[PDB]
Write an enzyme that holds these catalytic residues in place. Structure first.
Site, PDB file in Angstrom:
ATOM      1  N   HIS A  30      -7.057  11.551  28.738  1.00 13.95           N
ATOM      2  CA  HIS A  30      -7.461  11.839  27.359  1.00 13.95           C
ATOM      3  C   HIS A  30      -8.884  12.341  27.262  1.00 13.95           C
ATOM      4  CE1 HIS A  30      -8.813   7.444  27.136  1.00 13.95           C
ATOM      5  NE2 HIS A  30      -9.849   8.068  26.607  1.00 13.95           N
ATOM      6  N   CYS A  64     -13.807   3.975  28.890  1.00 16.07           N
ATOM      7  CA  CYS A  64     -12.595   4.390  29.579  1.00 16.07           C
ATOM      8  C   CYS A  64     -12.924   4.914  30.974  1.00 16.07           C
ATOM      9  CB  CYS A  64     -11.884   5.470  28.758  1.00 16.07           C
ATOM     10  SG  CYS A  64     -11.147   4.714  27.287  1.00 16.07           S
ATOM     11  N   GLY A 104     -16.453   4.915  25.250  1.00 15.29           N
ATOM     12  CA  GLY A 104     -17.084   5.412  26.456  1.00 15.29           C
ATOM     13  C   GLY A 104     -16.814   4.588  27.713  1.00 15.29           C
TER      14      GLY A 104
HETATM   15  C1  LIG Z   1     -11.928   5.224  25.720  1.00 16.81           C
HETATM   16  O1  LIG Z   1     -13.283   5.269  26.071  1.00 16.81           O
HETATM   17  C2  LIG Z   1     -11.881   4.507  24.396  1.00 16.81           C
HETATM   18  C3  LIG Z   1     -12.141   3.033  24.645  1.00 16.81           C
HETATM   19  C4  LIG Z   1     -11.920   2.122  23.428  1.00 16.81           C
HETATM   20  C5  LIG Z   1     -12.443   0.728  23.841  1.00 16.81           C
HETATM   21  C6  LIG Z   1     -12.588   2.713  22.192  1.00 16.81           C
HETATM   22  N1  LIG Z   1     -10.496   4.725  24.232  1.00 16.81           N
HETATM   23  C7  LIG Z   1     -10.062   5.650  23.264  1.00 16.81           C
HETATM   24  O2  LIG Z   1     -10.855   6.177  22.553  1.00 16.81           O
HETATM   25  C8  LIG Z   1      -8.584   5.866  23.143  1.00 16.81           C
HETATM   26  C9  LIG Z   1      -8.184   7.307  23.365  1.00 16.81           C
HETATM   27  C10 LIG Z   1      -6.706   7.566  23.110  1.00 16.81           C
HETATM   28  C11 LIG Z   1      -6.341   9.038  23.036  1.00 16.81           C
HETATM   29  C12 LIG Z   1      -5.845   6.864  24.152  1.00 16.81           C
HETATM   30  N2  LIG Z   1      -8.253   5.403  21.825  1.00 16.81           N
HETATM   31  C13 LIG Z   1      -8.033   4.027  21.516  1.00 16.81           C
HETATM   32  O3  LIG Z   1      -8.068   3.155  22.335  1.00 16.81           O
HETATM   33  C14 LIG Z   1      -7.773   3.719  20.037  1.00 16.81           C
HETATM   34  C15 LIG Z   1      -9.079   3.125  19.547  1.00 16.81           C
HETATM   35  C16 LIG Z   1      -9.019   2.757  18.063  1.00 16.81           C
HETATM   36  C17 LIG Z   1     -10.329   2.126  17.628  1.00 16.81           C
HETATM   37  C18 LIG Z   1      -8.755   4.031  17.259  1.00 16.81           C
HETATM   38  N3  LIG Z   1      -6.724   2.732  19.942  1.00 16.81           N
HETATM   39  C19 LIG Z   1      -5.410   3.165  19.557  1.00 16.81           C
HETATM   40  O4  LIG Z   1      -5.196   4.315  19.274  1.00 16.81           O
HETATM   41  O5  LIG Z   1      -4.419   2.204  19.558  1.00 16.81           O
HETATM   42  C20 LIG Z   1      -3.191   2.667  19.056  1.00 16.81           C
HETATM   43  C21 LIG Z   1      -3.122   2.384  17.559  1.00 16.81           C
HETATM   44  C22 LIG Z   1      -3.343   3.381  16.612  1.00 16.81           C
HETATM   45  C23 LIG Z   1      -3.251   3.083  15.248  1.00 16.81           C
HETATM   46  C24 LIG Z   1      -2.966   1.790  14.848  1.00 16.81           C
HETATM   47  C25 LIG Z   1      -2.766   0.807  15.807  1.00 16.81           C
HETATM   48  C26 LIG Z   1      -2.863   1.096  17.157  1.00 16.81           C
END
Ligand SMILES: *[C@H](O)[C@H](CC(C)C)NC(=O)[C@H](CC(C)C)NC(=O)[C@H](CC(C)C)NC(=O)OCc1ccccc1
Ligand SMILES: *[C@H](O)[C@H](CC(C)C)NC(=O)[C@H](CC(C)C)NC(=O)[C@H](CC(C)C)NC(=O)OCc1ccccc1
Lengths: 306, 306
Positions: free
Chosen positions: B41, B145, B143
């Protein structure tokens, strides 16, 4: 999000760990520039640990009586001296992996990481606090002596602890890297006991702030307290007095969360008087006191090293 | 003595961490030989992450769209490909600090250390367990990930986890180092939730054995249970079933302590039904489940790594 008991990355310290053997005793040493530091009880003999005369035992040694190895590489000792409860073994090679470092003597309530080692090899890393009675609650077996405690900031390793002994309550005692014990303990097997272990109030409050940052808000209430009235309750629960300095260092967390310090003190007062009523905070059923305010800010802001 | 949540020393993994940037998205990569592994991603934008088509998004990418930095030094990407949910970036330099390593797939209940990183630099290290619902309870910010989980064994680093995402309870999910998720999750920002969490029964029993080893015996009782009857209790308190294979795995701890496994099950049944009555076990007021039987044996026996 999430909040865990996190240690510093240990790689800078792992490159300084060596094995020191004298007679049949092997323990760990710390190799910085051309000196290896290790606990002086490596020279003790097993029938004479009640009151060893370290002076006598050491002056009879030659440099070759200390066998030092870094990994599988023998280091040649070219001098030896005693400084308080540690030995400084002068070696013929400066450690090329010496980080920028300093020797610090920490204060009760401060935290650090322990790199637990055996036979000069690291086996694990964990976070500890210097208790108010100048012991730590570690995990140390026979042969762990000479394992060190440290903090990092930017690229500088502040070494603050060297491990020497275990007291009967399963708690641990050791020195700074000047070789002076934390607390009143001595490196001989005479009867010694830790004093009162009190709870580090400012750290509990920091961890309550960490809980709010990470979405645990159930303990927040509509009350406040004066510092005086909080401390009157605190003393009854064997908590250390909160001072104005403590309130000052909680400032940044209070600002970030919008919860005034004395309002968080009111939440803590209610937790002390009433308990958690079957709930948990950051996965704990106890009030956690081994995170400093700076530990919380470092973890919640993603601070990194070198 | 003493018992702590101990992580593996992190230096061998620190030497592998790099920064990967694509457009304005920055995360961590794992640099092993001439390959950098990272979550796919990284190629998503601010609006791509809702339901990205990664094949389509790679049409729009060439090698110089991946800026890789190891410390200060820019690595040059000379190939890239997608494998499951990770990218493999071929670089023109082999990592001189590549440790002896393997990629492993862990199962629920197993533990590992996480080196949390930002911008390719280490923030800290902590021990995790893969929960029965295939999530971990970590400490990860935007950040983070590409941070990895690992075990160390003899001389070899066994990578088992790469971080990709946070689900709304503050739960964390990711892949093995082949890029296959643990659990029923996908790398997109569509609503997903883990199964309800349960407690890793075999690990709680291991930790009760650790407690006995370290002097805590107040929970031992004179009662007996069968595997069936104990599991009736486990199910009511949302504990995972205890199998005969688990009983076999606990055999060595049972032999070391002289406490039959089903007698320890009787002790745990009484703790579940009545609580701790104001006592603690190894400094906790709740039943700890992130130590495996192997973790207990290894910490109580001082196993080291190089
Ligand atoms: C990677 O650095 C970052 C780490 C987290 C600790 C923020 N991961 C992401 O940004 C990741 C990228 C996607 C494309 C896989 N997104 C998520 O982890 C996302 C973070 C939230 C705060 C938006 N979580 C998520 O999408 O979970 C699925 C979801 C969506 C909507 C409702 C419930 C669950
Ligand atoms: C160093 O590797 C080893 C590590 C410990 C965690 C076991 N330390 C020692 O062996 C140390 C050496 C002496 C000469 C300083 N001894 C102790 O730590 C000793 C362990 C017990 C089990 C004998 N602790 C001790 O002597 O405490 C003082 C004491 C003596 C008698 C009664 C109460 C307290």
């Amino acid at each position: 999000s999430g909040f865990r008991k996190m240690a510093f990355p240990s790689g800078k310290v792992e490159g300084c760990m060596v094995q020191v053997t004298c007679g049949t005793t092997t323990l760990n040493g710390l190799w910085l520039d051309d000196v290896v530091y290790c606990p002086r009880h490596v020279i003790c003999t097993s029938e004479d640990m009640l009151n060893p005369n370290y002076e006598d035992l050491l002056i009879r040694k030659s440099n070759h009586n200390f066998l030092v190895q870094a990994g599988n590489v023998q280091l040649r000792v070219i001098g030896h001296s005693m400084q308080n409860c540690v030995l400084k073994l002068k070696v013929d090679t400066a450690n090329p992996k010496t980080p920028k470092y300093k020797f610090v003597r920490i204060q009760p309530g401060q935290t650090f990481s322990v790199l637990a080692c055996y036979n000069g090899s690291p086996s694990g890393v964990y976070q500890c606090a210097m208790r108010p009675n100048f012991t730590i609650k570690g995990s140390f077996l026979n042969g762990s002596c000479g394992s060190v405690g440290f903090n990092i900031d930017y690229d500088c390793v502040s070494f603050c602890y060297m491990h020497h002994m275990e007291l009967p309550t399963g708690v641990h005692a050791g020195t700074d890297l000047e070789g002076n014990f934390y607390g009143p303990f001595v490196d001989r097997q005479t009867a010694q006991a830790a004093g009162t272990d009190t709870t580090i109030t400012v750290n509990v409050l920091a961890w309550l702030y960490a809980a709010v940052i990470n979405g645990d808000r159930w303990f927040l209430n509509r009350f406040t307290t004066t510092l005086n009235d909080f401390n009157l309750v605190a003393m009854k629960y064997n908590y250390e007095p909160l001072t104005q300095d403590h309130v000052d260092i909680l400032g940044p967390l209070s600002a970030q969360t919008g919860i005034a310090v004395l309002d968080m003190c009111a939440s803590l007062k209610e937790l002390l008087q009433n308990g958690m009523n079957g709930r948990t905070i950051l996965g704990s059923a106890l009030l956690e006191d081994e995170f400093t305010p700076f530990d919380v800010v470092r973890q919640c802001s993603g601070v990194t090293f070198q």
